[PDB]
Design a binder for these strands. Sequence first.
RNA 1: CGGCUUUUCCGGAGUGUAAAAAGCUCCGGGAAUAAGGGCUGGGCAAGGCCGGUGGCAGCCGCCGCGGUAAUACCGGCGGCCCGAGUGGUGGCCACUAUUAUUGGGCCUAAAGCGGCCGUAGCCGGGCCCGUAAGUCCCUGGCGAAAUCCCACGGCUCAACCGUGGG
Lengths: 227, 143, 129, 93, 173, 60
Amino acid sequence: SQEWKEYAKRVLDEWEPKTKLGMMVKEGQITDIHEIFRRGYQIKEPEIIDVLLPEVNARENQEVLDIALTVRMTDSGRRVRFRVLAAVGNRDGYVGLGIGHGKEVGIAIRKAINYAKLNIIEIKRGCGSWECRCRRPHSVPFAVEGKEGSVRVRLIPGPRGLGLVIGDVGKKILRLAGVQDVWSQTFGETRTTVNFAKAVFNALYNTNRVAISPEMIERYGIVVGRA
Amino acid sequence: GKKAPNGEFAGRKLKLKRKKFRWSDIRYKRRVLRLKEKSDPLEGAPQARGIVLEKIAVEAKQPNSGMRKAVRVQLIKNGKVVTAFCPGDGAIKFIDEHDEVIIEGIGGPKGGSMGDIPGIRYKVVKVNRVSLKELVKGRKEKP
Amino acid sequence: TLLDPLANALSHITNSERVGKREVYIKPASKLIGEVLRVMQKYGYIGEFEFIDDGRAGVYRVQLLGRINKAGAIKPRFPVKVSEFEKWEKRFLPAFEFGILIVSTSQGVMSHKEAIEKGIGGRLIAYVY
Amino acid sequence: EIRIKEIKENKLIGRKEIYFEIYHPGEPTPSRKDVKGKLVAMLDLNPETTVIQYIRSYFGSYISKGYAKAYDSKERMLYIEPEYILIRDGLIE
Amino acid sequence: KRQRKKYETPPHPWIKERLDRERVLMDKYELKNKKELWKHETQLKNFRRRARRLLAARGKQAEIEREQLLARLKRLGLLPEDAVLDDVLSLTIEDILERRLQTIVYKKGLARTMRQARQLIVHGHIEVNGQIIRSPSYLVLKEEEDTITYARTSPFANPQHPERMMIEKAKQG
Amino acid sequence: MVEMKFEIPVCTSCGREITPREHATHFICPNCGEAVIWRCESCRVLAKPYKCPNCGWEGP
RNA sequence: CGGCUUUUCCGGAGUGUAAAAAGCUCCGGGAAUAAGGGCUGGGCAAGGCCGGUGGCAGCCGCCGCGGUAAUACCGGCGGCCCGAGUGGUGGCCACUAUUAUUGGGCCUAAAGCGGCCGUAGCCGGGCCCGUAAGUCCCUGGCGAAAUCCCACGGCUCAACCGUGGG
């Protein structure tokens, strides 16, 4: 923890705020991460979030999902290009996904992680299974459906200690989302990793779309982000 | 429109439609009329005991180039004659003319010809009751 | 031609609230529609609902509170006893005890939660969450 | 060492059933004759009217169960009890 | 009717994460086969299934079975005496593993190693309440652990068996 | 562990909560000038009218 | 290198028969003394160097490998999965929402008949009254045993068996 605070202070020194959102996170009247989400500004500087959520920089909090090797081509050759899909996030309900183009492996990795940082979102969590009911945000609060491309994904709450029963892409995405047990159903082509990952991301984002009265906030221990 | 019929008193048609279209399936048709169990030369037998008649080889499908050894087996059970691929390195020499042999399906897609060699359906396991794999390894001896 | 007022009404409500209007008018008003409208309003899903004497079949006026996510009438009136009720909760609701269902028991149209303690079966009529 | 739990009298047969336990920690299983001469002492029975069928020693157990019968007259065994446990006890050649 | 296997194989023989998560426990607890670990996993899974079944049940038989389940879980020494139906979902494999006879007999300091304790058990040298068991996989109850001593007939019930002093020094060390 | 229970804003026109990356807006009341009026993206796109909580002024 | 017990291993003693054998149970002599199978390019990804053949020989469930460097054939070593098990093949379920009631599609990918009418069948407007067949709640008789779930108890435990509840 203290190392993360040290890194936060370091970047607070080095970074100079360009976008309007930079000042009040450098000046320090914003300390909550959810302050960014609630009002609905826009994020463009990668330094904005690691000040409040430096844990992204951990090697266990960042994951490289796939390394696609695409090919433009001309009369005088096939010019390759790297497209890397990778995810970052703290394990308390804040995750981002990114795709990075490049000409080398490392360049794509860097750009992908940087863009993933900008895709940070807030994840409601809970316990809505018919067998757990433990009021701890160990899983989704309710069953949700996400769509992207052809792929559709249904995430159903599951009991404690079951683990994530889902494809490895959703496995990693949810593991970085601070969720431990969920039933998964996948419709469409799941071989294309990118659409699957994006659909999982969109489902997690759609969790916040459901209207909730406080009674179920108590009933499932619904947490908006950090628990 | 809406998938039909959805009526509470529509059991007859809801059943008839499904039964009818289950015939559009091919695997179910293949089972219930048992025509796998009427076209089979092996009559649903994962093994059979046959006599060899002559050794033949076939050209691998392109771009695969080579010579795939095999033999021709008439079946003592019923009398049909089929090709029989022989595996192993230089194993054609081990399999001789007029040999009691044990033959078994080759486990390709749907039981079809395996991999890069066409037509064939079966491979040899035991020759004169002696397992061919060891004889490829030379551990045993043909009687 | 029209076949079922209730499912049309529930689809009307859902579609009208997806865009997010405020006052919704349902044309084919009947008694069962009113008995239905009682239930969820008793759970605070909708605001006021009232009946307007048109002169042909009556209209139903409802104010929408923006609470419902999906509200639809299960058509084929599945009769369900008590002890197996859970087998249908997994089919129409997003989570444990999220939302409700409407059953027409011997004692009238009324919410499913209130039927568990009343110990009455009946035929599923609609659902909302 | 042998210690009793069950001593039950069947008066339709006029015969005594004895269920007893033998403590044999660390030594080989006792034989039929030894326990036969052991019980008769402190139960004070006629040896010829007394017969044993089974003595079961369990796996990994130093305490073994055993059952014996104690009749009154020399004809009761010849009539009622089967012929094996006289031969196994030597009562019949 | 044909007697069925009591344990469940993993759905995939070659997943890295599951393989290594197995291997760490195999080296830690030193079981002969992954079959044993799978058996104990299934043993857990039975409790989990019973718990999740009962939690959604309304009826007298449901409650009665629930109380019986809680009672026998507590009897095994898995749970505290005031446990409820909600905490079983948080149980782990290691909670079962520590209750294994081999594990417990080692934690009594009666062996210098897991394998040494296993050898003593399988060679009929460890007694429970004066009874000998030759199965290190056995799971002990909460009312018998105090009876775990050396078998009387064993040479190691004798306090000067040459291995015994080394065992007790290791206990000291 | 402090549970920092934030107040997720709610739109005035419809009452729906505001998801993180929504393009919603927050602005001061048009007539009483003290009440904060939120407007969610769905409310914004079709521009359905909104009403003040304080003075009951109506404004798209 | 030093020490420890003997899984089995020879003898004796119980049971065993109504004949033993079973070697089931206890004691004594007592040696470290039984382990293979498959895989090693990827889909399986768990796992790499060398010798040999060089589009021949062969391997290969699918993708692929070899026209002289083969990390993919064969030999050696190394390594990997499982374990008195392990491989090949054939039949069945799932994988599959590729049988779609739950739960699929039919403009361009197989898939709306050129169009209309119309019988059976199916699906049908609102309100009141009656009936109560369906529908729902309660209750009597009844669906054998065996199998299945759980507690306890017996055989080391287990399996197995019984007592009790379902």
